[PDB]
From a paper:
The LH1–RC purified from Rba. capsulatus wild-type strain NBRC16435T using two-step solubilization followed by DEAE chromatography exhibited an absorption maximum (Qy) at 882 nm for LH1, and the cryo-EM structure of the core complex was determined at 2.62 Å resolution. The Rba. capsulatus monomeric LH1–RC forms a crescent-shaped structure with LH1 containing 10 αβ-subunits distributed on one side of the RC with the other side of the RC completely exposed to the membrane region. Surprisingly, and differing from all wild-type LH1s with known structures (obtained from ~10 species), we have found that the current Rba. capsulatus LH1 structure in an RC-associated form contains only 10 αβ-subunits, making it the smallest LH1 complex reported by far. PufX is located at one edge of the Rba. capsulatus LH1 crescent and interacts with one pair of αβ-polypeptides and the RC-L subunit. PufX in the Rba. capsulatus LH1–RC has a “turn-up” conformation in its N-terminal region (Ser2–Asn12) that self-associates with its own transmembrane domain (Trp21–Tyr28) and interacts with nearby LH1 α- and β-polypeptides. The self-associated conformation of the N-terminus of Rba. capsulatus PufX prevents it from interacting with proteins in another complex, which may explain in part the inability of this species to form a dimeric LH1–RC. Twenty-five bacteriochlorophylls (BChl) a, eighteen spheroidenes, two bacteriopheophytins, four ubiquinones (UQ-10) and one nonheme Fe were identified in the Rba. capsulatus LH1–RC. This BChl a is surrounded by two LH1 α-polypeptides, the RC H-subunit, a phospholipid and a detergent molecule, and is coordinated from the back by a putative myristate at its central Mg.
This purple phototroph contains PufX, a polypeptide crucial for dimerization of the light-harvesting 1–reaction center (LH1–RC) complex, but lacks protein-U, a U-shaped polypeptide in the LH1–RC of its close relative Rba. sphaeroides. The photosynthetic gene cluster in Rhodobacter species contains a unique gene, pufX, which encodes the polypeptide PufX present in the light-harvesting 1–reaction center (LH1–RC) core complex. Although this is generally true for the structurally more conserved RCs, our work has demonstrated that structural differences in the RC-surrounding LH1 complex between these two closely related species are significant and that a broad diversity is possible in the structure of this important component of the photosynthetic apparatus.
Numbering used by the authors:
A (entry chain X): 2 to 66
B (entry chain L): 2 to 282
C (entry chain A): 1 to 44
D (entry chain H): 1 to 248
E (entry chain M): 2 to 305
F (entry chain B), J (entry chain E), R (entry chain J): 5 to 48
G (entry chain D), K (entry chain I), M (entry chain O), O (entry chain Q), T (entry chain S), U (entry chain V): 1 to 56
H (entry chain F): 1 to 54
């Protein structure tokens, strides 16, 4: 992949290896942000979209007794 | 344990995350990165449902119910004993559903087939997200989502439906029901037609697809064809779920009164509204 | 204790670090979201 | 019959619901066995029959008799051996079970993985009247009713290099459907490209599954105007294997 | 994005296929035409259609049922064309009131509903023998007729069997757009929340399963159309790589799979369960159970 | 010797030593973050 | 206890460690969440009452 | 009695210990949850009453 | 005889370790039950 | 075939030694955590 | 009487032991469930009344 | 009646034993559950009244 | 009466004996259940009255 | 008259056993009905 | 009146006997239920009155 | 004719057994109605 | 006939042990009913 | 075809001997369990 | 001339026995209506 | 009237007999059920008034 | 009025006869049912009024 | 449509005839059974 | 349109009218009886 | 001629239909 490059273990300094680990972990953290942002975008986007509704949308009767 | 032909297909590659770290099978099941996360989310969601049963005090599976937060709670993260457990299970369910679809993508890539199955399943995920996330947030609270119980989520359907009178009069609901009925009808005919050809009358050779086209042209005067029926069966099921999600998306967000009153725009048109007689006088 | 380096002979480091990033990021999100259920630590 | 209980609260509705579970439990058993007519008995990674075979038994053999009087029996050892690939170029990546098999060589040419083809019968698929189901357009009298006619269009490979031109279309006569496009490469040889893995643009045909260098090794058809079920399996599997094995 | 094989890229049409002459009296088939708009998703050929006596009997009595309802609407509209179009969805051909039992009600008070129902019963049954006979003359199995029989089972329970067991035609379904929706809602109300009918739940599981199964199977075949997976009949006789990749997708996903022929046994049985269990649940409603929610509470699965 | 991942025992030691140095830095920062919260708003 | 190393001659370490890791994280989350569901052992609400922050 | 070792000539050890591991965990969780469901044997509830955790 | 491919000697070595682990698992379970019986008897 | 994994006895012995060291450290931390919670908020 | 061993000439020992194990466990759960459903034989309910634990 | 052993020449013994075993278990459960449904023959309720188990 | 054995030349003995057994069992359960419906022939109800059982 | 393939002699022994089994079923059924008639007659 | 045997030359004996059996059984069940549904000819309630069964 | 593959001799022998069994079924049914007529006449 | 493939003598061997098991099952069942009849008769 | 499983007569006797030992041990514990419950809370 | 593969001679045999069966059906029906008319006339 | 045997040269005897068989049965049931509906001709509720069975 | 025989050269005799059968049977039932509905021409109601049978 | 137009037109004649005849029965003025009942004292 | 020659259709019409006339006669006889029993005119 | 057959038969049907309409008038007229 573009962000999941392999590393040259036999030809590489510790700092280059240390940076490579961080790039790998950052790419993993970026992948983990895909569902978090999508979920956050769903919740806040839907709530934001609901704030521009005819205002009877926020006072519907509860479906639970 | 492999099928007699499975070995030549069990090859490395096709993963999206992790490469060969999780690229293996457990029995028949393929495990990937999303196989690992599906197991985590499915097991956590299942154990939290059992924990919710323990707090509820009942162990009858048909009486277990995890309820969302109260409507007054708004969009806040609720306390675990006060409907916040429902929110955790909702995240576990969505994590399990989404990772299940992504796991199917990895399996699609390994087998070299089209991605129709994960995409078709994403429509089912979308309808679930409409009922638990999109619609409740547009209405302002997590308390409008359905509960996680076998028979209590039917009470939610009943209470949600009767909020707008008879829910049958929702026009998107009519379209969704018609497609759901059409999908079951086409599934019966597709299964029957293939089995009719593959299992002919005794003493007859196995029928060709020419017989299948001939049979439905003789019967109805039309035949979609072997490729057409699988396209159409997929589209009917996806449209049925999509227009169902629309019916709920507009109920309580755009439309608030009884759905039976909506159909009176046709009657109240100002060129036949005043004419006496009929049903509406 | 000093022999834990052999974990990289079992699991490919290139692939584990990506998995660590997914886990560590989502754990930080999970803890922040758990804090919100309590208004006392509800930072926002 | 309302409020009539045989014992306790077990009324006629209770009898019906419990009767249904017994019928449903049997129906699932019937459906599961009917789906064990292919791919059984199970095997291990080493090829030997497996110890575990599952809670459902293999159903009794049933016979499909074809129009040519073949009498295919499923499940049967001969039917399974007919569709069994031999001399597969695969090696085990670990001693443990449940691990992938590494191709030893070129997976596209050896037909393994997503490029796997099945030894189908080396004969053309035949309609009810006995004729070949799939035939070239020149062999029949059909015209392009709608859509984009691909005849004469250049064929652009996945690496954005032009590899030839479409010279013919192979249609499914009983279904009135185009199955393959016959491409004439720059070298003069003719190959078949399944329509399901092509895209006909307004001015060209693009094949993203494989690159330009792999077009000369697309499996060939022995008869110029006849395509065979075995050849269809080889051509389809070769092109579909490109998505994983084309360039990397 | 690659080709998703949802619509044909090229349409090719020649002489329309007039069909197979197995035992069909081919002189009873109409001409065959080609309709291009239908050829993008499926076949472009429209016709030929077989018209025997079963189809002709079904068509005339179906038309009579359709026109019997229609003329009643004109009577309800005062024979005013504008009122007819205004209230088309509100018109209803109601069954006779409960005072007449299973007798022949007056024409104005449910007798027409009995006439229309008789025409519908003939038309549906005349069509069932058409479904059976068309398959018989082509040497095919009678799976379509048996699957149709499951739909007839629920339809006959709603209109014929349950009114007989309930002792009056009044419980039958009115012939109207909104009215038969109101009947459906009223059926649930006066039987105590039909949601708690177990066979209604089984019917819904089959109906949801039918859409789940057709989405699974429709997408599975389109995924393996690269290898001719839509030619299912040839895959049954001569298994190809389309059948194996389709089986291996579901084995690696669910842990178990079907075959090309066997997936259509799941398809037919999932679909007939919709109306097989549905017919049983409607028959039990009123005749055996009058309050499904209370019945539920007795049997668990409903809180006390 | 075992090397499920094709790393030598020497290469695993070098990678693990770098990884543990980053792991120690990551924990030390996280401890500092907890001390900030513990000072501002203790949870015990 | 002196012969327990033979486990690794039956179960490959790669799959056992992956299964063990998911099980431990799953169990830890389950137990932490069970305590958070119990208001008397919810350390966040206990800290709120001890010091006094919102109490709502 | 002393011949029970032959169960490994019939049952694959890898299949069994997966099934045994799932069984023991799901059983152990089930029994703990049953006790937690009953206030009498909910050791968390017992502790709040004992120590006045409120 | 040997549906799993193991030999008689291997199955004994498997069972000896399994019984060693089983006995330890039962021993802790007995102590745990004894502790609960002392703390909060269910009989 | 009591070598389903393909490891030798020597390789399994040294893998088990490292695994038992990681388990021991994990159990030791859990015991310390439970001691701290027991002192802070006992559950018995 | 001493000829029952021939059952193993008909039924696969792998299949029988698995089905027997599933049956024995599910049967045991069913009987324990019936006793727990009966308040007279629910040993947890009996214990909380004998020792006066909570009774709530 | 000495010829009843020829049943096994018509029906596969493995399928008969499984089907008979499933039948006998379900029949026994059905009869036990019938007795449990009737309070007169419910041996748990009879023991409750006999021994004063409160319930 | 001397030619009834030719029924097996028309129907498979496997097919007949399976269908007949399902028939006989279903009929027997039907008749037993009909009696249990009627309180006059419910032998458990009759035994309760005769032997003075509780039948709460 | 060979829809099943029996050799007109297997059928005789097939039917001989069937009637012997049928005879046993009827005899128990009659004995059962005689017992119920004595216990409580339905006529 | 001796040409009735020609029916088997146009009707499959396997199909006739199955159809006849289902017809004969369903016809008998219908008649028995009809008598059962009429109190005058319901032999269970008739025996109850004659022999004085409780019929609770 | 011969739509079923039976011969003239096969069909005649099949019909003879059918009528003998049908005669037995009628004989029992007639006896049953005589018993019902004595016990509880419907005329 | 001989659909299952067993010889006549194998059927005798199989039926001999089937009836011994059936005799054992019914012997327990009769003792079970005798015990219930004494404890709580249903007649 | 009375050798469906492929075992020999000798193997079946060996397998059945072990099975009856396990069955006897299972019954003996079950009898002890019922005897204990009959003493604790009889159901007759 | 045969629309369903019946010879003219076959149609003679088929119609003759059909009318024989029809004649018996009417004869029993005529007697049944005579008995009902005597038992309970509807005119 | 001597040439009515030509019908079997036009109609399939197999289909005619099945159609006639269902028609004769359905017609006979319909007439019997109408008679049962009418109390004057319901032969069951004539004997109960003649011999005297229930009168209720 | 004697050239009507030509119509059988066009229509299929099978479908004309089946159409005749359905139309005639449907009309016959329809006319009978109208008479049954009208108490003046209900021959059963006339019979019970003429013979004094039940009148209920 | 030499053999097809006749069937459709006959249906139109049949549907209309069965329609108007029953309508006359609905109206008591045009009901011949009703007037026959009054004359003969049925 | 049918596939029947003129000679084969000659008896086809004769038998149909032979059967139709018998059907009419029974209907005529039935109406005469009903008029005698319960006239509607 | 096909049409020649139809017109003669159709006219006879109309002829009796007219004769029946006037048969109603002499028995019970509306105009
Ligand atoms: C397994 C259960 C599911 C199912 C299955 C199923 N349905 C089936 C079948 C099967 C297997 C068939 O084989 C059968 C069929 O033929 O399918 C194509 C059928 C069928 N299911 C149908 C409908 C249907 N199925 C439904 C449901 C279901 N079917 C279930 C979901 C529903 C719903 C949900 O309500 C409907 C509406 C039909 C398409 C067909 C049966 C059609 C039939 O019997 O028609 C008889 C003829 C008529 C009623 C005539 C109608 C005429 C028009 C009203 C127009 C008239 C006037 C016009 C101007 C024309 C001219 C008239 C004259 C002047 C000439
Ligand atoms: C008679 C009445 C009894 C009810 C029907 C039971 C089944 C009857 C079956 C009849 C035999 C049959 O199956 O005939 C069918 C038509 O039946 C038909 O209309 C039947 C029309 C009436 C059906 C509805 C009856 C009331 C319900 C099929 O005809 P076709 O395919 O067009 O023919 C093609 C040629 O071979 C000429 O025949
Ligand atoms: C509703 O009813 C309730 C639930 C309330 C009550 C019902 C309770 C029931 C039905 C309970 C049932 C309980 C049962 C059946 C429990 C069974 C428990 C068993 C059999 C436990 C066995 C455990 C064995 C263990 C933990 C063995 C561990 C072994 C090791 C740790 C060593 C590892 C070595 C291995 C895995 C193989 C060695 C390999 C080589 C090469 C030597
Ligand atoms: C609702 O309306 C009511 C009911 C109130 C009033 C309406 C009444 C109506 C509409 C009544 C209509 C009645 C009709 C049309 C009755 C018709 C009855 C007929 C035609 C019955 C015919 C029966 C024929 C039978 C039983 C023939 C039987 C033949 C046999 C038993 C012999 C077997 C046949 C063989 C062997 C043929 C094979 C031979 C060869 C050589 C192949």
């Amino acid at each position: 992949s573009m962000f999941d490059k392999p590393f040259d273990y036999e030809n590489g300094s510790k700092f280059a290896m240390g940076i490579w680990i961080g790039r790998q972990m950052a790419y993993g953290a970026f992948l983990g942000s895909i569902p978090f942002l999508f979920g956050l975008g769903l919740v806040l986007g839907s709530y934001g979209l609901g704030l521009m509704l005819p205002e009877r949308a926020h006072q519907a009767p509860s479906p639970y007794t | 344990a492999l099928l007699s032909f499975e070995r030549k297909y069990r090859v490395p590659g096709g993963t999206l995350i992790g490469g060969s770290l999780f690229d293996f099978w457990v029995g028949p099941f393929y495990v990937g990165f999303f196989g690992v996360t599906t197991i985590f989310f499915a097991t956590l969601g299942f154990l939290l449902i059992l924990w919710g049963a323990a707090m509820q005090g009942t162990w009858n599976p048909q009486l277990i119910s995890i309820f969302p937060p109260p409507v007054e709670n708004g969009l806040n993260v609720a306390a675990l004993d006060k409907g916040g457990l429902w929110q955790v299970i909702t995240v576990c369910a969505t994590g399990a559903f989404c990772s299940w679809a992504l796991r199917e993508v990895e399996i699609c890539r390994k087998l070299g087939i089209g991605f129709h199955i994960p995409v078709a399943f994403s429509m089912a995920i979308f309808a679930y997200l409409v009922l638990v996330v999109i619609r409740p947030m547009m209405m302002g609270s997590w308390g409008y989502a359905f509960p996680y119980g076998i028979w209590t989520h039917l009470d939610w359907v009943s209470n949600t439906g009767y909020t707008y009178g008879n829910f049958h009069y929702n026009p998107f609901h009519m379209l969704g029901i018609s497609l759901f009925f059409t999908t079951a009808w086409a599934l019966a005919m597709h299964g029957a037609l293939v089995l009719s050809a593959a299992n002919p009358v005794k003493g007859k050779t196995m029928r060709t697809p020419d017989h299948e086209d001939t049979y439905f042209r003789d019967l109805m005067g039309y035949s979609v064809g072997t490729l057409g029926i699988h396209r159409l069966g997929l589209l009917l099921a996806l449209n049925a779920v999509f227009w169902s999600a629309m019916c709920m998306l507009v109920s309580g967000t755009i439309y608030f009164d009884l759905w039976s009153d909506w159909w009176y725009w046709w009657v109240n048109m100002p060129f036949w509204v005043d004419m006496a007689g009929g049903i509406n006088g | 204790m000093s022999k834990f380096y052999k974990i990289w002979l079992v699991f490919d480091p290139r692939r584990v670090f990506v998995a660590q990033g997914v886990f560590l990021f989502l754990l930080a999100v999970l803890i922040h979201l758990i804090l919100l259920s309590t208004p006392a630590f509800n930072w926002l | 019959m309302v409020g009539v209980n045989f014992f306790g609260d077990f009324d006629l509705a209770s009898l019906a619901i419990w009767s249904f579970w017994a019928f449903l439990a049997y129906l699932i058993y019937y459906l599961q066995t009917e789906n064990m007519r292919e791919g059984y008995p199970l095997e291990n990674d080493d090829g030997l029959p497996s110890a575990n075979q599952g809670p459902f038994p293999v159903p009794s053999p049933k016979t499909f008799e074809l129009a040519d009087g073949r009498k295919i029996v499923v499940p049967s050892v001969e039917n399974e051996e007919a569709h069994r690939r031999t001399d597969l170029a695969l090696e085990r990546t670990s001693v443990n079970e449940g691990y992938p098999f590494r191709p030893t060589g070129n997976p596209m040419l050896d037909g393994v993985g997503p490029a796997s083809w099945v030894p189908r019968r080396d004969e053309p698929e035949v309609d009810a009247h006995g004729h070949n189901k799939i035939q070239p357009m020149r062999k029949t009298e059909m015209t392009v009713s709608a859509g984009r006619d691909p005849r004469g269009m250049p064929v652009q490979a996945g690496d954005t290099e032009v590899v030839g031109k479409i010279v013919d279309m192979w249609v499914d006569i009983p279904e009135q459907l185009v199955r393959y496009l016959e491409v004439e490469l720059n070298s003069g040889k003719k190959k078949l490209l399944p329509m399901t893995m092509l895209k006909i643009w307004s001015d060209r045909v693009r094949v993203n599954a494989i690159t330009s260098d792999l077009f000369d090794t697309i499996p060939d058809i022995k008869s110029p105007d006849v395509v065979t079920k075995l050849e269809e399996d080889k051509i389809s599997a070769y092109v579909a294997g490109g998505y994983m094995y084309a360039k990397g | 994005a690659e080709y998703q094989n949802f619509f044909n890229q090229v349409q090719v049409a020649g002489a329309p296929e007039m069909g197979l002459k197995e035992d069909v009296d081919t002189y009873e088939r109409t001409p065959a035409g080609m309709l291009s708009i239908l050829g993008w998703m499926g076949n472009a050929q429209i016709g030929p259609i077989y018209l025997g006596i079963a189809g002709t009997v079904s068509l005339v009595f179906g038309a009579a049922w359709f026109f019997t309802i229609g003329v009643w609407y004109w009577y309800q509209a005062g024979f005013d064309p504008f009122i007819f179009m205004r209230d088309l969805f509100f018109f209803s051909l109601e069954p006779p009131p409960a005072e007449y039992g299973l007798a022949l009600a007056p024409l104005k008070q449910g007798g027409v509903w009995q006439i229309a129902s008789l025409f519908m019963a003939i038309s549906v049954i005349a069509w069932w023998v058409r479904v059976y006979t068309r398959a018989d003359q082509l040497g095919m199995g009678k799976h379509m007729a048996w699957a149709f029989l499951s739909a007839i089972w629920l339809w006959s329970v709603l209109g014929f069997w349950r009114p007989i067991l309930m002792g009056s035609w009044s419980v039958g379904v009115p012939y109207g757009i909104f009215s038969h929706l109101d009947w459906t809602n009223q059926f649930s109300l006066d039987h105590g929340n039909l949601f708690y009918n177990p066979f209604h739940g089984l019917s819904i599981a089959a109906l949801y399963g039918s859409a789940l199964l057709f989405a699974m199977h429709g997408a599975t075949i389109l995924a393996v159309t690269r290898f001719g997976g839509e030619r299912e009949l040839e895959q049954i006789a001569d298994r190809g790589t389309a059948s194996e990749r389709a089986a291996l997708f579901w084995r690696w996903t669910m842990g178990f799979n079907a075959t090309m022929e066997g997936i259509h046994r799941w398809a037919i049985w999932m679909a007939v369960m919709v109306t097989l269990t549905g017919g049983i649940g409607i028959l039990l409603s009123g005749t055996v159970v009058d309050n499904w929610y209370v019945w539920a509470q007795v049997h668990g699965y409903a809180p006390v | 010797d075992l090397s499920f991942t094709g790393l030598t025992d020497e290469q695993a030691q070098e990678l693990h030593a770098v990884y543990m140095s980053g792991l120690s830095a990551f924990i030390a920062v996280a401890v500092l973050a907890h001390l900030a919260v513990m000072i501002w708003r203790p949870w015990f």
